[PDB]
Amino acid sequence: MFAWWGRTVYQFRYIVIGVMVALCLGGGVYGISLGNHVTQSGFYDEGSQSVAASLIGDEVYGRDRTSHVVAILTPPDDKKVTDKAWQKKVTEELDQVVKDHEDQIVGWVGWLKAPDTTDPTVSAMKTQDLRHTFISIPLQGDDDDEILKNYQVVEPELQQVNGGDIRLAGLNPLASELTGTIGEDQKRAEVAAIPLVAVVLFFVFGTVIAAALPAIIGGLAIAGALGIMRLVAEFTPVHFFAQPVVTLIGLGIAIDYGLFIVSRFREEIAEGYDTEAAVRRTVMTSGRTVVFSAVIIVASSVPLLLFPQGFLKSITYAIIASVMLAAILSITVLAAALAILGPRVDALGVTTLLKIPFFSRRIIDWFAEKTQKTKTREEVERGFWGRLVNVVMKRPIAFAAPILVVMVLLIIPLGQLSLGGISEKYLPPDNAVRQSQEQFDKLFPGFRTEPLTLVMKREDGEPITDAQIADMRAKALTVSGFTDPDNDPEKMWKERPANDSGSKDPSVRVIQNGLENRNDAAKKIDELRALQPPHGIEVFVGGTPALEQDSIHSLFDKLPLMALILIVTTTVLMFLAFGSVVLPIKAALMSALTLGSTMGILTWMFVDGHGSGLMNYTPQPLMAPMIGLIIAVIWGLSTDYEVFLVSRMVEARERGMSTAEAIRIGTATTGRLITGAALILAVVAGAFVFSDLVMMKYLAFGLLIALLLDATIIRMFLVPAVMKLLGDDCWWAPRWMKRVQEKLGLGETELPDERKR
């Protein structure tokens, strides 16, 4: 299967480069505008009762646009908001903002529009000290994306009102910054991470062409991934987190996959193999490993398609596209470019600085060339990678328990993990928009309300009568734990306000009430849905707490099945990649341990708050949908690095080496290579840890911790110790499973020919 591809990619090499570079470039050009077709929603269980309630209330009572953007106005100098000179001017400027942008702004409403009024609620829109007033500017639009775009249109002009003495909070001021952090993260990843990646590539290869080829492959992979997701956005909505995940996860993986291909090609050239044989032996082993790693990533990502959150579906699509494209690219285009070049992949290297005499740097050139030279196989067995491997294998209990126990102690802090929703606390505490929102919540309390909503349908389209709502309210009073602002039971569970954008049909009635304590939300929601609906009436329990809690419940209910699918698919793929039954369980146990330790440290840093003052974020409950996301990502990459480490050991064992010899050779041959791959992906991740958005920081830190554990506490001295302890059982698998593997054309994990060279 892979030998045939190794033959044909070298033979048909000038008809691969063109087609599969032109396609990726065209995809990149088509998808540069991916950010113009992203959807901000997707965090909710769209099949749940809360989403149904939200839809029914919105289409019967109208979309509530009163909370879209609020603006706090402060008069200049000392004078109070009652200043008629100030009021006139701010009124006329608001009128200009509305008029000149009528396609984006329904209007503005507030105490400043009717300064001499009598409504207690309207008169509560100004502070007691007569220093601050606020207004609400509804925005024209049918969905959140259109409203956000309109807000972004009006932002520059809405910010010059009152000379600048205006602070914007609300849904869309928050959303604009929650979406601009994505662009800022991408900007840093493009301006800072790329040179560091290109430096690590040069230090792992020592040649500009050899180092550059994986970089070109990774760039092509991300361009094609953006193209594929832009195409996908024409059929189903895609979250705005697709394009960072492609850069954060897809790019590093794509670089690593091509790094392994180029390194193995140069390894076969150094042996003595001509370009054709070097390409074929590179495919049969390195390309097989890369394809297996990509399929493992895909199989560990597809469980996320089982969760209702469209955010997770979009991220899974992005990951699958990027990783499969990287796998295809590294073995088609990179393999045909290496076939075309051959010896020229080591042509323009450190020896170029030497020729130009511009004797310190003169000798430095030679030293840096000797460091990254064409090494030999016998010397890397007696290098650092191999001395460390042997000393660990000598005393393999003393390197396992002192690691196992501390990695369980790292899982210990996972018991305080709490789940939560998105808010302005997802931005750094010194952000202007967060500060404006907190200023609004401090000056004008009781206006930011998240009530639980009882949405009632009548089964026959007849109007709901007053007796039905009276019984529903009477029952809802039999649930303790809901806000009673005026100490009057008859004033609780008031009907939702009706806009002019609602059906107003008398068969649907929505009543709302806040709950005193947020932490009882679920208990109240599980108790509002326990009330007997009155005869005929269908009752739904929605609201922002309901949407959030249903989102958490949907992920808790479908998480064990995610774990089962993860374990079974990845262990079966490991068996087909290794030919052993013992190795897949050994690697799955370590992947589980690495995942547990990473999650424990993440709960330590982001929920418990240790490190929150240094990295400038706020300790808070984690975003519910992203728990499964980061579980899948960490599991996939941990399995990838296990495969990178263990494929060489399996190949050495199939050659005829003993267990210890196979462990030594496998770690030594891939030592600096896995080190460079981890360094590159860590550069990409660390470019994302300075994100303003807390969930991005959490995911990138999880990536970094998983990398460090897998490459420095798992690669060097846990896998060798456990394999030495297992012994000859490491390479065992029943004949009925070897028959299955060999029947598929993937049984070949041994490089048998040993010819020519």
Instruction: Please say whether the beta carbons of 111 and 80 come within 8 A.
Output: no
Angstrom CA distances, 607 to 54, 211, 375, 694, 744, stand at 30, 40, 47, 11, 47
User: Which DSSP helix (H) or strand (E) runs through 369?
Assistant: helix 360-371
Angstrom CA distances, 92 to 70, 103, 154, 727, stand at 18, 19, 16, 83
Closest among 215, 277, 254, 264 to 9, alpha carbons compared: 277
Cα separation, 553 vs 276, in Å, equals: 56
Closest among 297, 320, 323 to 221, alpha carbons compared: 323
Closest among 562, 554, 490 to 522, alpha carbons compared: 554
Structure tokens at 38: 């992203």
DSSP 8-state code for residue 603:
I
| Burial of residue 745, with CB atoms counted within 10 A of its CB: 0-12 exposed, 13-18 middle, 19 or more buried | exposed
Structure tokens at 551: 């989102």
Instruction: Give the side-chain half-sphere CA count within 13 A for 426.
Output: 20
Instruction: Please say whether the beta carbons of 261 and 287 come within 8 A.
Output: yes
Cα separation, 700 vs 691, in Å, equals: 9
40 labeled part of a ligand binding site: yes
Structure tokens at 197: 């990646």
42 labeled part of a ligand binding site: yes
The residues, ordered by sequence, that sit 6+ positions from 601 with a Cβ below 8 Å of its Cβ are: 410, 413, 705
14 labeled part of a ligand binding site: no
Tally of CB atoms within 10 A around 214: 29
Tally of CB atoms within 10 A around 156: 8
Cα separation, 331 vs 254, in Å, equals: 11
Instruction: Please say whether the beta carbons of 334 and 345 come within 8 A.
Output: no
Q: Greatest CA separation found in the chain?
A: 97
Closest among 545, 523, 527, 387 to 453, alpha carbons compared: 545
Which three-class secondary structure state does DSSP give residue 544?
helix
257 labeled part of a ligand binding site: no
The residues, ordered by sequence, that sit 6+ positions from 579 with a Cβ below 8 Å of its Cβ are: 650, 654, 731, 733, 738, 741, 747, 749
Tally of CB atoms within 10 A around 161: 20
| Residue in the structure block whose two tokens are 């049969």 | 284
Instruction: Please say whether the beta carbons of 324 and 294 come within 8 A.
Output: yes
Q: Which amino acid is at 644?
A: F
Tally of CB atoms within 10 A around 726: 16
Dihedrals phi, psi of 513, to nearest 5 degrees: -165, 135
| Residue in the structure block whose two tokens are 């790693």 | 293
Instruction: Please say whether the beta carbons of 718 and 400 come within 8 A.
Output: yes
Tally of CB atoms within 10 A around 365: 18
Structure tokens at 63: 């979309």
Resolution, Å (one decimal):
2.7
Cα separation, 495 vs 469, in Å, equals: 10
Structure tokens at 267: 């390894």
User: Which DSSP helix (H) or strand (E) runs through 433?
Assistant: helix 432-443
Closest among 646, 637, 647 to 594, alpha carbons compared: 637
Q: Which amino acid is at 732?
A: W
**What angle separates helix 251-271 from helix 275-282, to the nearest 10 degrees?**
130
Instruction: Please say whether the beta carbons of 451 and 518 come within 8 A.
Output: no
Cα separation, 240 vs 42, in Å, equals: 10
Dihedrals phi, psi of 208, to nearest 5 degrees: -70, -40
Strand (E) positions, 367-477?
419-420, 452-457
Tally of CB atoms within 10 A around 57: 24
Structure tokens at 347: 């042509």
DSSP 626-661: HHHHHHHHHHHHHHHHHHHHHHHHHHHHHHT--HHH
Cα separation, 63 vs 300, in Å, equals: 39
Cα separation, 44 vs 46, in Å, equals: 6
Instruction: Please say whether the beta carbons of 15 and 504 come within 8 A.
Output: no
Cα separation, 638 vs 296, in Å, equals: 10
The residues, ordered by sequence, that sit 6+ positions from 183 with a Cβ below 8 Å of its Cβ are: 35
Tally of CB atoms within 10 A around 455: 26
DSSP 8-state code for residue 239:
B
Cα separation, 661 vs 356, in Å, equals: 44
Give percent helix, percent strand, percent coil of the chain, each to the nearest 5.
Answer: 65, 5, 30
Instruction: Please say whether the beta carbons of 256 and 710 come within 8 A.
Output: no
Cα separation, 456 vs 464, in Å, equals: 8
Count of H helices and E strands in the chain? 30, 10
Instruction: Please say whether the beta carbons of 696 and 185 come within 8 A.
Output: yes
Closest among 73, 7, 551, 657 to 287, alpha carbons compared: 7
Cα separation, 411 vs 417, in Å, equals: 11
Decide the pairing of beta strands 419-420 and 622-623: parallel
620 labeled part of a ligand binding site: no
10 labeled part of a ligand binding site: no
Closest among 50, 106, 109, 116 to 82, alpha carbons compared: 116
- Technique behind this structure? cryo-EM
Report angle CA 55, 57, 62 to the nearest 5 degrees. 100
